[PDB]
Amino acid sequence: KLSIAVFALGCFWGPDAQFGSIKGVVSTRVGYAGGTTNNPSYYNLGDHSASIEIQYDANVITYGELLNIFWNLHNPVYETTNRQYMSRIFYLDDGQKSEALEMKRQIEAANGEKIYTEIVPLENFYLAEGYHQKYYLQNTTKLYQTLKAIYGGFGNLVRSTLAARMNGYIAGNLSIASLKEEMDLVELPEDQYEKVLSIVEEIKL
Numbered sequence: 001k002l003s004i005a006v007f008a009l010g011c012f013w014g015p016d017a018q019f020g021s022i023k024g025v026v027s028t029r030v031g032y033a034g035g036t037t038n039n040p041s042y043y044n045l046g047d048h049s050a051s052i053e054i055q056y057d058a059n060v061i062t063y064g065e066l067l068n069i070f071w072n073l074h075n076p077v078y079e080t081t082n083r084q085y086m087s088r089i090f091y092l093d094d095g096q097k098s099e100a101l102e103m104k105r106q107i108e109a110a111n112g113e114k115i116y117t118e119i120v121p122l123e124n125f126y127l128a129e130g131y132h133q134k135y136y137l138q139n140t141t142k143l144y145q146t147l148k149a150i151y152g153g154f155g156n157l158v159r160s161t162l163a164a165r166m167n168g169y170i171a172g173n174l175s176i177a178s179l180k181e182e183m184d185l186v187e188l189p190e191d192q193y194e195k196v197l198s199i200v201e202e203i204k205l
Contacts, residue, residue, distance in 0.1 A: 002026055004092055006122050007066075009052075009074045009087050015030075016133075017170070017173050021164075021178075023060060024056050027160065030050070032125075034090065034123075048083065063096055064103065077114065169200070176200060179200060180197070
């Protein structure tokens with residue numbers, strides 16, 4: 001049982017890697033939300049926005065902290081009508097709504113500019129195609145294939161915390177020292193640990 005935040009802030013590969021590097025974020029999935037069509041997809045997006053679903057442990061990280069990260073990853077001071085990349089916070093309850101509105105106000109004061117992020121109720125979130133999930137890890141072949149076998153398949157891997165952290169590491173958002181502490185948490189048999197560690201070290205070089 002975990003808490004959920006859904007945000008939109010442009011192409012979702014970067015946010016997936018960024019949020020997936022954060023302690024308290026348990027899993028991430030990218031997808032589409034904000035539109036009015038059912039079952040959108042990459043080449044049939046309708047009016048939906050590229051979005052990220054963050055499953056987080058509220059005992060470890062707060063919604064307010066996630067909002068702070070959201071507004072540090074982009075600076076939405078422009079009014080656009082490009083639905084696919086629009087800055088949006090999809091709130092799941094009135095607590096999230098009020099926290100979002102308050103922080104938006106604090107930002108607009110501290111830095112002087114109007115923020116155009118739309119704070120709207122979450123309707124439906126639609127998972128994106130598999131090739132979009134954990135995009136950087138998925139395209140780091142040896143590490144990806146090694147981890148996928150350890151986790152028992154694609155679905156199990158992309159839903160895991162370790163894949164979220166590994167994707168962040170590849171993107172440059174997590175240190176190798178932090179990554180190694182995350183690997184320790186999973187309690188792999190020592191030969192799997194050493195196999196993964198060797199690929200990860202060889203990537204840092």
